[PDB]
Amino acid sequence: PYRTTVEIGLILYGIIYYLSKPQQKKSLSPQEIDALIEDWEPEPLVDPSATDEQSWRVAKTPV
Amino acid sequence: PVTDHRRRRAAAVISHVEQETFEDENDQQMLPNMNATWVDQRGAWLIHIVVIVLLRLFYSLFGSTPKWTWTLTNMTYIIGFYIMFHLVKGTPFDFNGGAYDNLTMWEQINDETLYTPTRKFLLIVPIVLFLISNQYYRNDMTLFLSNLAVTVLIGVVPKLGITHRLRISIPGITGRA
Ligand SMILES: C[C@@H]1CC[C@@]2(OC1)O[C@H]1C[C@H]3[C@@H]4CC=C5C[C@@H](OCCC(CO[C@H]6O[C@H](CO)[C@@H](O[C@H]7O[C@H](CO)[C@@H](O)[C@H](O)[C@H]7O)[C@H](O)[C@H]6O)CO[C@H]6O[C@H](CO)[C@@H](O[C@H]7O[C@H](CO)[C@@H](O)[C@H](O)[C@H]7O)[C@H](O)[C@H]6O)CC[C@]5(C)[C@H]4CC[C@]3(C)[C@H]1[C@@H]2C
Ligand SMILES: CCCCCCCCCCCCCCCCCCCCCCCCCCC(=O)N[C@@H](CO)[C@H](O)[C@H](O)CCCCCCCCCCCCCC
């Protein structure tokens, strides 16, 4: 009866604990949010490094 | 202050230990703990059976009834395990600067991993011991209730997913963070 019921409860929790999750592993402030904003460095809209070397096409276009 | 390193002692009925900051967690816990590393080693799982057998034989050498012997051995084993693991907080030797001054040995096992085989074994053993032991004092309901209360209250509730980093201020103002 009750003596069997509590034993069944303990055993039932036993298998539940045995087949637990797959080894669960142990796991920001607004003051540092502005630091991330200030650390952002965007890129130029257009790259001008190779403009000079490739500019002969415009100079050779007939008008 | 330029460092702001203080220990808080907030008082409430239910409270939890705050999560460690970057410096305390990612940097001050790098070397082996040397306090919870011996659990997963050679001969660290059979020693509990030897302790139980030795206690049972020592109590049987007195020449008492089986009921009293088994109740006493169960209570002694559970109380000893609780005193060793769950009661004390800290480490017997300085680790870095006192990083583990808010946690017990149970929490430090396997780098605060919730479910590992050793924890499963440690949770399984008291239930099996109780199932084996109850067969001698089933007639007496008071001893059955006492054994059930001891097992559930001491050997089951602390080893749970809940009651992890859980502190109660009833027996003293505990320190968190
Ligand atoms: C069958 C039979 C039945 C009968 C029987 O046998 C079996 O049943 C048995 C039942 C047994 C007891 C069961 C369990 C314990 C606790 C254990 O515990 C670890 C060792 C000690 C330290 O533990 C602390 O370790 C950390 C550092 O302290 C704590 O860290 C924080 O606190 C730091 C504070 O700086 C901060 O840095 C941070 O906040 C943070 O780091 C941490 O919280 C806590 O774990 C235990 O406490 C100490 O407490 C005082 C120091 O705090 C000592 O001094 C005091 O001694 C006198 C009294 O007050 C006064 O004259 C002095 O003035 C006054 O100072 C005292 O001697 C000593 O006991 C020590 C053994 C003992 C008592 C057993 C004794 C024997 C029995 C009575 C048997 C018994 C005979
Ligand atoms: C005649 C008969 C009576 C027999 C009495 C003995 C009862 C035996 C049954 C209960 C014991 C559990 C059985 C499993 C243990 C197997 C052996 C493992 C040995 C490991 C030893 C190395 C561990 C190093 C880490 C140190 C450590 O943990 N530091 C702290 C946390 O960082 C802990 O706070 C600390 O150690 C515990 C405090 C020391 C003992 C407290 C009680 C004072 C003596 C009174 C004894 C009461 C009887 C019950 C224990």
Q: Which amino acid is at B150?
A: V
Alpha helices in B25-157 (DSSP H): 47-62, 66-82, 105-108, 117-133, 141-150
Q: How far is it, in rounded angstroms, from Cα B99 to Cα A8?
A: 42
Q: Which amino acid is at B76?
A: T
Which is it for strands B15-16 and B166-167: parallel, antiparallel or unpaired?
A: antiparallel
- DSSP state for residue B59 in the 8-state scheme: H
**Residues ending a continuous segment of chain A before a break (C–N > 2.5 Å):** 27
Radius of gyration of chain B (CA): 19
- Rounded to the nearest angstrom, the gap between the alpha carbon of residue A49 and the centroid of all alpha carbons in its chain is 33
- Rounded to the nearest angstrom, the gap between the alpha carbon of residue B35 and the centroid of all alpha carbons in its chain is 14
Q: Inspect the interface and report whether the beta carbons of B131 and A6 lie closer than 8 Å.
A: no
Strand, coil or helix: what is A8? helix
Kindly report the protein residue whose alpha carbon is nearest to atom 43 of ligand 1: B89
Q: How far is it, in rounded angstroms, from Cα B79 to Cα B84?
A: 9
* Nearest atom, ligand 2, residue B88 CA: 34
Strand, coil or helix: what is B13? coil
Task: At A24, list the tokens.
Answer: 């669960």
Kindly report the protein residue whose alpha carbon is nearest to atom 36 of ligand 2: B84
- DSSP state for residue B66 in the 8-state scheme: H
The CA-atom distances, in angstroms, between A19 and each of A22, A24, B31 are 9, 12, 31
- Tell me if chain B has a CB within 8 Å of the CB of A25: yes
User: Determination method here?
Assistant: cryo-EM
Q: How far is it, in rounded angstroms, from Cα B166 to Cα B86?
A: 12
- Tell me if chain A has a CB within 8 Å of the CB of B130: yes
| Whether the Cβ atoms of residue B162 and residue B168 lie closer than 8 Å to each other | no
Total Cβ atoms within 10 A of residue B177: 15
Q: How far is it, in rounded angstroms, from Cα B9 to Cα B169?
A: 10
